[PDB]
Amino acid sequence: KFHILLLNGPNLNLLGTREPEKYGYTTLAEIVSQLEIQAQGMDVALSHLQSNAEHALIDSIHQARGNTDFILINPAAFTHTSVALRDALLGVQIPFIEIHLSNVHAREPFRHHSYLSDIAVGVICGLGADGYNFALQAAVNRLSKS
Amino acid sequence: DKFHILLLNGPNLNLLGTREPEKYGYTTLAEIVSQLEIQAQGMDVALSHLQSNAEHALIDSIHQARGNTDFILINPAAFTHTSVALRDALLGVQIPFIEIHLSNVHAREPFRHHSYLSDIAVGVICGLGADGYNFALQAAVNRLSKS
Amino acid sequence: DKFHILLLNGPNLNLLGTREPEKYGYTTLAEIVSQLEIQAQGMDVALSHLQSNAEHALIDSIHQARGNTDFILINPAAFTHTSVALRDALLGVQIPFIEIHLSNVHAREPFRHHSYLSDIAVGVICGLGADGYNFALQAAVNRLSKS
Amino acid sequence: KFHILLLNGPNLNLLGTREPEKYGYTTLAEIVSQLEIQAQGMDVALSHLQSNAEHALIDSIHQARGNTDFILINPAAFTHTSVALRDALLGVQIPFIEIHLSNVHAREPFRHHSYLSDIAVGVICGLGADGYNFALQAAVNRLSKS
Amino acid sequence: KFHILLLNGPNLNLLGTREPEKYGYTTLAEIVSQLEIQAQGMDVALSHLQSNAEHALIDSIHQARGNTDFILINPAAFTHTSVALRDALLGVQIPFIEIHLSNVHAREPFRHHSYLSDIAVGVICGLGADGYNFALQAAVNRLSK
Amino acid sequence: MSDKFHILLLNGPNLNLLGTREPEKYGYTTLAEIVSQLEIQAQGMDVALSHLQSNAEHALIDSIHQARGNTDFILINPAAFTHTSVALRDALLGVQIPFIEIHLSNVHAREPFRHHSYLSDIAVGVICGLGADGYNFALQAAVNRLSK
Amino acid sequence: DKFHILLLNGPNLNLLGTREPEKYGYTTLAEIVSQLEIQAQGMDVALSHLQSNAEHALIDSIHQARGNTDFILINPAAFTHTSVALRDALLGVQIPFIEIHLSNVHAREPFRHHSYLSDIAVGVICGLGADGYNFALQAAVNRLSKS
Amino acid sequence: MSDKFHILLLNGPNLNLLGTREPEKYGYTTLAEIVSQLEIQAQGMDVALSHLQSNAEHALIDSIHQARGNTDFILINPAAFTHTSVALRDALLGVQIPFIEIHLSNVHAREPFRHHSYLSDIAVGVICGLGADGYNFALQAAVNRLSK
Amino acid sequence: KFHILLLNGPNLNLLGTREPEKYGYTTLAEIVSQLEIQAQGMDVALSHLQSNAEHALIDSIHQARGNTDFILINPAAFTHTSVALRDALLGVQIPFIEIHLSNVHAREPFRHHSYLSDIAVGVICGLGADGYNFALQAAVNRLSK
Amino acid sequence: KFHILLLNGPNLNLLGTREPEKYGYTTLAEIVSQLEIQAQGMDVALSHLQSNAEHALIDSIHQARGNTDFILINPAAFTHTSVALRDALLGVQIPFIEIHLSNVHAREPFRHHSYLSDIAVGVICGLGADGYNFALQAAVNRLSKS
Amino acid sequence: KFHILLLNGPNLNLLGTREPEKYGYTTLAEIVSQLEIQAQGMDVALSHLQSNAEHALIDSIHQARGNTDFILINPAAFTHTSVALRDALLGVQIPFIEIHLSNVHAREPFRHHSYLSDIAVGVICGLGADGYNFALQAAVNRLSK
Amino acid sequence: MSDKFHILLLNGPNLNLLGTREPEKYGYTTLAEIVSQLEIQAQGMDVALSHLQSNAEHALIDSIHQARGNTDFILINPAAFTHTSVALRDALLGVQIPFIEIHLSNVHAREPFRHHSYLSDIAVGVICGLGADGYNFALQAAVNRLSK
């Protein structure tokens, strides 16, 4: 069975709380529950962690070594700032896909910079929660080739 | 009225599957497009396609989409880094689009980080190979099916 | 021998008057051009026109102007930011030109501040809408009428 | 009747004095007299001020508030340097057109920078004194729509 | 009754411990205690947290949602580095004022960059502890309108 | 030479316009009202306060020069000149009277060019974005520092 | 099997010999090409040529060279500074090339220092006028004659 | 307060992974082995050595704060934090304990972003690219300087 | 008889008033008076203006047209900021030498930028008051050829 | 008879010594001997100097004044660093062609910068030793026009 | 028997001559002599050259080809400027360690740039003369494996 | 050790060419003529003057080193080396002899790369664009400063 770790970075716990009539009502719990149902349908063992702590995400990545086939990560703000997270992913050598709900290129210029996009298998941005669904499909498709 | 989606492919994508296939892969552009057509039929969506090495042909296609096209899926290839004219065609016609790249364009030269399209796209998918077209189509139909 | 002026319009300008007219305005490119033709006739000047989304077509037009054209009026649209080839066509044929933009291109994205044409133009008019073409034509004829 | 203020910035009083056989014989007084005749023909009330003093231009702009429909300004060197002039124009909220006699993009790279061009209705450069004539036509055309 | 949250970032626990004959004797606990007294006089409930941990500041901000009217924050070094902190503040939509004890424009050029100043109501720097007093007054003045 | 502190308030270009631009959406408070309020506050603190607003860079420089030997602290809202005037910076450095820089609006929430300043690095401190209250706080800060 | 070399000339090079010949020189593009053809015949090499102002035409020519062309000689003119699509055509077909400029493009505007081709070229010759084409051809044939 | 020097060794994020990534091509030496070797060296020099490795920026900052009044020198391999942590820089500046910065690999032979550091300019010195031996040399350097 | 105009920019009126035991006692009036005497010995008529106002310097330059052979200018802070001053000098086409008392390359990096140095005949910096003496000699030497 | 000076800069004496099975076996002595034979065939008087010393190259250039018609120079690393060499060439006003064996644009970004390319008649890079042959042909062709 | 070449760049001959009560008394000859003794204890033959001439350093490197196992170099100012020195080292393919006595990141920003650090085995800075001792130990440790 | 001042004049690369390039349009004055004139001026001021011109960076560095303990001031026209030689900067800093930088031409009126210098920030002052007279003035400046 394939084992996939879903990581959500800082502030994603707030999803669906800020002016939802403007920004959307979907919550992180709903996205995760949706992806668990999908993974179960594909015979994937999915694990999840959301954290506002950089160290907790790094620890999860370290703990994945030897037992996890792929990482799906929405790094949120840490994609722009965390060399430590980059080095955690590089150190464990588990492939990953980077996911952003919104289009991060349509915002401040500082959000164009990433310490993860260049080492990711790929990146999905701007497609909302569907991005997680697609990333999971892509991971399973890849793992199924070899 | 079923949705109509226009798939645009930019320069050099006609070469897919021809450079060192045992190394880079065998999938051709015609295979990708024909698969996407059958996926679209399954979603009860009409799909038109154009691949061109000519910036003007892509621009003309975008202009011609006015009033008959609900969404654009575009793999702009090298034109994403260079074509303000394509950006302005897309803005001019006001049809939403998703930008697709087969490879991870952030893992190559620094100049490929710059785009005249990524900021005005609904979203972007890179590095997932041909599947990125399937996901972009699903994304488009999901978005259209809400509104 | 009356003066002959070539009016060139670049990419996407064929869309004028079609995007949200109550917001952006109703004037079309054909209306602007037909008005400029009648203005030119009044000044006893011959006026030729080409609009194209193809860089090569604009370049070919500039080449073809050699020996028959006294001045060029060009709204290069997005190509002003990207086309060194157009710059080099203009320098190659040595026909003076004025650069025209309908909108104030300094009030939009920072990338639109860069031009490969503005430094070699006689002058530049931006932000005055269609009137900018009328003023550019008057400017050209005034300059030709001195020399 | 429409009321239009023409402002000329520093050094424009020297027009027609420097190597005129090379640079031109037209003087500022001639341009202004030409524009006054034109404005009178259009039924526009035209006022003028040329100054080498930034504060005098700002004061003129402040004094225009409530009585002036449009500003035509050749800011000369101040277009590259004066945030105060920008803020005067923004503060009084009178639309303006920026005029330069010469093509300022054909000179030093520092002359490409402007604190006015982005907030102007439009800009005319490189057409010599005719630029003022066209700017006045444009202003009247605009004012005549609404 | 207004509720205001005072957040202090990394290293501010060291205030008054480094060469005080040179840098001053005022400690963080003194500043906070003095501010609490000022708040009581203004009918404001003042909560406080100092932390060297980015996540603890983010968590405090999240926990302020629905019960806090204004945030006063001295982000210290995180103002230059934390997009996550910026996004916490944007996400909860509680207005805030940024406070620095020293003039952070008089130091290294890297200190000129901030991920918070552009989204703050305002910024006060270089005025020492009084900056907190002024920020608190500003906050109450704004909430009272 | 008295024992009473004397503070000079300087206001730069365009600040005379305060309260005239879209009053309903920006406020009706005028510069005259801000200064008169600050004069009352200063009286209450038993401190002398002088004021000058000018659109002329040289007038502000001359005021700074004329403050030598009679002014304990300068409060300055330089407005647009903070981004452009090396001459004002050098006037303040030349006179060695401490100052606080004040902006009504948050200048970091505007164009990127407004992030640059020739004064903020040599000021005792900076207050921005707090409206007229920033003048009140800067005066309190000045008096508090002088009273040490 | 003799070697086959494709000579590509980019935009505005059709104007060679026409701008102020007493100042800039009289040699035309057709003269250069016809001389290079006779040089190629002497080296027992087949030489094909295309000059175009259209980026797409150059790209199509490069694509069409696959499987029949041993080396490409290209004077890209202004496209060297702007065309990522041409870079990607060359990389896509994996035919080695030499970049040729008639004039010293480092002695003009700073923007002409940037190239999307010079880093992937076997080499570059600039500033030697028409002779640069002769040298590039000799270089190509020498390289092919070793391997 | 003793006469014996006390040195604090700090190891930043991901250094716990040492010896786990492609061992045949990168080596089998673990962080535990490096620290135990350094403890033996320190014993031999009659110096006390404390160690902490953490993936948490705050844990390293807290360790630095807790070193006040008991630590003569800090040896730090900050790993990725050297490029990003102004907070660590300010912890070290706040405590005023001298330190040496250590990197196992040559960080200048990697991505250009790794050339930037918030620590290298305030360190006594920097050692990079010499593998585990860099820790040995940094400890020798520290003791040599303290012994002056 | 050559006529030379000496222009002094903003804040130079303060020369000799700030910590003179440290920065020196030489005042602007002393420098100008000494230079006047030197000029008299060289058969030069020397005119002078110091101003904190950009427009006053520009006006002086304009007024020099047709009656002034050379300009010696210590532009002070305006060298870094005034395109208008550059254009006044270009417009009147009177050659000039730029003088700074201190070494303006030994200070903030912003002081390295100038709108005048590239169009000056030459520049003298860091030599104190002597720089004016040398500039005057240079000017006369050039006019005498 | 035309007189041409060939200058080779630092490290070019190592040619053919570093991993020749990978980088090539051609030595500097062979290139120079090849060019001497070529020059003799063209009736050109060729002089050569290779040096690792910037001053020696500058001195050679100074000594060429009045007796040398053209300079062929492979400046090696000095093209990126030596303003003095640029000023030597400018000072003596002898035209030159710049030659690099390898394609210097395919290496580190710092190698794109040159203090010589902009004042050279032309530049040849990436064609190996043939580059010297072509440069000599170009020089003779030029000299033969006038 | 390993052979190691120690190269010292420009101005290092001045070590110990400028304000020694402030900057220290250790001279280059003392450092080299001490290192020679250390080398003898490690069965290493140590050769040395200090030069203010770029070409002399380049020549020494070229002459090391085939007889030298490792290079220890304190390039001084040339680390920031000499592409030629970089290419000499690359050309001869002898591994090297870069040594600086002072912390060159604590000085002007221009000193952060190097044409050697990225191709060195490693770099040691700011540790004074000990840096040479450590570099020598590192070199021997690496050659002994 | 005498009471007479000793000044060292250094001329950098290519300055030996003075007077040879297009004489009719650039002038016929040679370096030899400039130096001989400066020697006469120095004699007149009762000051000793030594001179060296070299195209070799190391020769200039060695001259600077050899000036230690015998030279009161250095006058240097570094020519192209001002833009490139950190080594010369460090020689001058190492010897702590004050210097003035001299350029015959206005180097700010040329290519932008000539605006950068490794010497101008550590020089007492700089004179450019005044031709040979710049050497005369720099010598006067040096003697005037030493005479204080």
CATH number at residue D130: 3.40.50.9100
- Verify whether the Cβ–Cβ distance A11 to E84 is below 8 Å: yes
- CA-CA distance, L39 to A32, in Å (whole number)? 87
Instruction: Give the burial class of E21: count Cβ atoms within 10 A of its Cβ; 0-12 exposed, 13-18 middle, 19 or more buried.
Output: exposed
Q: Does L57 touch chain J (CB under 8 A)?
A: yes
Q: Determine whether the annotation assigns residue G103 to a binding site.
A: yes
- Verify whether the Cβ–Cβ distance K18 to L96 is below 8 Å: yes
Q: Which residues of G touch B21 (CB under 8 A)?
A: none
Q: Does L91 touch chain I (CB under 8 A)?
A: no
State CA I106 to chain mean position distance. 19
Instruction: Report the sign of the C-alpha dihedral through residues D27, D32, D37, D42, in that order.
Output: positive
Which tokens sit at K136? Answer: 């020598």
- CA-CA distance, H77 to G13, in Å (whole number)? 58
Which tokens sit at I89? Answer: 């000098």
CA distance A122 to chain H (A): 20
- CA-CA distance, I17 to E54, in Å (whole number)? 50
- Cβ-Cβ contacts under 8 Å between A and B: the total is 74
Which tokens sit at K36? Answer: 């020679």
- CA-CA distance, L22 to L26, in Å (whole number)? 6
Catalytic pick from E48, E100, E115, E132? E100
Residue positions forming the annotated binding site of D: 74, 80, 87, 101-102, 111
**Contact status, residue C43 vs residue C108, Cβ threshold 8 Å:** no
The Cβ of residue E62 has, within 10 Å, a number of other Cβ atoms equal to 17
Q: Rounded to 5 degrees, what angle do the CA atoms L46, L52, L58 make?
A: 140
Q: Which of L120, L130, L137 sits opposite I105 (nearest CB)?
A: L120
- CA-CA distance, E134 to F140, in Å (whole number)? 9
Q: Determine whether the annotation assigns residue G61 to a binding site.
A: no
Touch between G and J (at least 3 CB pairs under 8 Å): yes
Nearest of B119, B125, B126 to residue B104 by alpha carbon: B126
Close Cβ partners of D44 (under 8 Å, ≥ 6 residues apart): D1, D2, D3, D4, D136, D140
Q: Does H78 touch chain K (CB under 8 A)?
A: no
Nearest CA in chain J to L26: J91
The Cβ of residue I141 has, within 10 Å, a number of other Cβ atoms equal to 15
- Verify whether the Cβ–Cβ distance E87 to A56 is below 8 Å: no
CB crowding D107-131: b at 16 or more within 10 Å, else e: eeeebbebbbbbbbbbbbbbbbbbb
Which tokens sit at F12? Answer: 């730069």
CA distance H146 to chain E (A): 21
3-state SS class at H6: strand
> Choosing among B14, B51, B53, which should be mutated to test the G contact, i.e. which has the most G CBs within 10 A?
B53
Nearest of H94, H91, H108 to residue H10 by alpha carbon: H91
Structural element, H or E, at residue I48? strand I44-50
List of E strands, chain H: 6-11, 48-53, 73-77, 99-103, 125-128
Q: Does I77 touch chain F (CB under 8 A)?
A: yes
3-state SS class at B15: helix
- Verify whether the Cβ–Cβ distance H133 to K137 is below 8 Å: yes
- Cβ-Cβ contacts under 8 Å between E and H: the total is 51
Q: Which residues of G touch J121 (CB under 8 A)?
A: 104, 127-128
Close Cβ partners of H108 (under 8 Å, ≥ 6 residues apart): H114, H115, H128, K114, K117, K118, K120, K123
Number of separate domains in chain K: 1
- CA-CA distance, G80 to F122, in Å (whole number)? 48
Catalytic pick from D25, D48, D100, D112? D100
Chains in contact with L, where contact means 3 or more Cβ–Cβ distances below 8 Å, are I, J, K
- CA-CA distance, J142 to K6, in Å (whole number)? 49
Nearest CA in chain D to I80: D81
**Contact status, residue I106 vs residue D133, Cβ threshold 8 Å:** no
Q: Which residues of C touch G78 (CB under 8 A)?
A: 83-85, 87-88
Residue G110 half-sphere exposure, CB side, CA atoms within 13 Å?
Answer: 5
Q: Which of E53, E59, E83 sits opposite A77 (nearest CB)?
A: E83
Q: Does K77 touch chain L (CB under 8 A)?
A: yes
Q: What are phi and psi of E6, to 5 degrees?
A: -100, 120
Residue positions forming the annotated binding site of K: 74, 80, 87, 101-102, 111
Helices (H), G4-130: 21-24, 29-42, 55-64, 84-93
Q: Which residues of E touch F126 (CB under 8 A)?
A: 103, 105, 123-126
**Residue H17 DSSP code:** G
Q: Does A84 touch chain E (CB under 8 A)?
A: no
Nearest of A51, A67, A116 to residue A90 by alpha carbon: A116
- Verify whether the Cβ–Cβ distance I123 to L108 is below 8 Å: yes
- CA-CA distance, D116 to D120, in Å (whole number)? 6
Helices (H), B43-146: 55-64, 84-93, 131-146
Residues β-bridged to residue H99: H74
- Verify whether the Cβ–Cβ distance H130 to K138 is below 8 Å: yes
Residue C24 bears catalytic tag: yes
- CA-CA distance, E79 to E123, in Å (whole number)? 12
Report A:23-52 residues touching H (Cβ under 8 A). Answer: none
Nearest CA in chain E to A54: E55
Which tokens sit at C17? Answer: 């008057």
Residues β-bridged to residue E96: E71
CA distance C1 to chain B (A): 36
- CA-CA distance, I121 to I137, in Å (whole number)? 13
- Verify whether the Cβ–Cβ distance A55 to H13 is below 8 Å: yes
- Verify whether the Cβ–Cβ distance H96 to E51 is below 8 Å: no
**Contact status, residue G8 vs residue G72, Cβ threshold 8 Å:** yes
Touch between A and B (at least 3 CB pairs under 8 Å): yes
Catalytic pick from K48, K100, K115, K132? K100
The residue type found at B75 is N
Give this entry's resolution in angstroms: 1.6
- Cβ-Cβ contacts under 8 Å between G and J: the total is 74
Touch between J and L (at least 3 CB pairs under 8 Å): yes
**Contact status, residue K57 vs residue K9, Cβ threshold 8 Å:** yes
DSSP secondary structure string for all residues of J26-57: --HHHHHHHHHHHHHHHTEEEEEEE-S-HHHH
Domain boundaries, position B73: 1-147
Nearest CA in chain F to D115: F113
Method: X-ray
CA distance G141 to chain C (A): 30
Q: Which of L109, L124, L144 sits opposite I103 (nearest CB)?
A: L124
Q: Does E13 touch chain H (CB under 8 A)?
A: yes
Residue I100 bears catalytic tag: yes
Q: Determine whether the annotation assigns residue J5 to a binding site.
A: no
Residues β-bridged to residue C97: C72
Q: Does F78 touch chain E (CB under 8 A)?
A: no
